Each structure stands twice: as structure tokens, then as C-alpha cells.
């Protein structure tokens, strides 16, 4: 799947005056896709483990906590919860 355009929206948010090369953009899209597959596969097995029919932010939080190291898991849990909160609110 392609996420290159959303990687660009983030790039313009972090570094408004910074560009990105095509190879570089392809690597970003490959990294986003590789991480997506890990998280998904992980949430998939937790829903399997708990006999759950619906995958929710609970499985994603559990997956993030398992696969993301150190300070990254703590911050990505704060970012995911915050986003779900402002969507559900």
C-alpha cells in the first residue's frame, strides 16, 4: 500500500522548508509498510489469543508495547490514546 503522500504531509509539518528525494520517499513508504505489517500481525494474534471478533485500540496498544522499544513505546502509546480520545470525544 502507498503512504508516500501522508509521509509528505508529516514532512511539511516537521520541516516546512525541507524536501525529500524519491529513493528517500520510497524508503519512508517501505518503513511505514513494514511497521504496519508487524503491528497488524501482532494485534491479529492477540485477537486470536483472546477469541475477540473485533480488533480495537486495545490490541494496538498491546502490540505497540510489545514491538516498540524504550521511549518509543511510551510516546506512541500517548499519541495513539490521545488521537482515539479526540476521535471518540
Amino acid at each position: 500500500e502507498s503512504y508516500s503522500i501522508y509521509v509528505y504531509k508529516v514532512l511539511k509539518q516537521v520541516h516546512p522548508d525541507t524536501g525529500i528525494s524519491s529513493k528517500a520517499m520510497g524508503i519512508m513508504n517501505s518503513f511505514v509498510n513494514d511497521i504496519f505489517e508487524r503491528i497488524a500481525g501482532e494485534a491479529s494474534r492477540l485477537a486470536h489469543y483472546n477469541k475477540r471478533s473485533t480488533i480495537t485500540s486495545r490490541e494496538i496498544q498491546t502490540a505497540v508495547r510489545l514491538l516498540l522499544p524504550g521511549e518509543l513505546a511510551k510516546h506512541a502509546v500517548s499519541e495513539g490514546t490521545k488521537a482515539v480520545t479526540k476521535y471518540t470525544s
Binding site: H15, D34, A43, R58, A83
Partner: protein, 82 residues
Amino acid sequence: SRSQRAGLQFPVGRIHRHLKSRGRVGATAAVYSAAILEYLTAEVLELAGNASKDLKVKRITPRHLQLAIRGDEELDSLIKAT
């Protein structure tokens, strides 16, 4: 958009479709997923745009991405476990 409601740049509905292609998948799973992916993209990008001695990179190339990821103990270990 639904992505704006969650305060994100990442496509929530597209991420929901990708999750389903990998039983039900709820909006929260899609919103939480977009948020974490957006988080990591922003962490990788923040560093690469600052991968200079003057800290000013005009255009991000694969050398900057290698400096960003390899230049970070946690991104390096994340990418390597993957």
C-alpha cells in the same frame, strides 16, 4: 475529515481498509494505528531534516534517513527487530 477529528495527517479509513485486508476492525484500532505510524514517521523525519552540522538539510536523501535511524538507538533497534 475523520483523520482531522483524531488530529492526524495519516489516513484512518485507508489504514482501516489495510487492517481488514490483513472478523471486524473498529475505528479505534484504525485511529490508534494511524497515530502510531504518524508518530514514527515524524520521529524519523524530524531527525533526518536535522542530520547536519549546520542542522539545515535542504532535501532529505537516503543518507539522512540512515543518519536519522542509525543515529537513534531505539529506531535502529526497532528497524532491526523488523
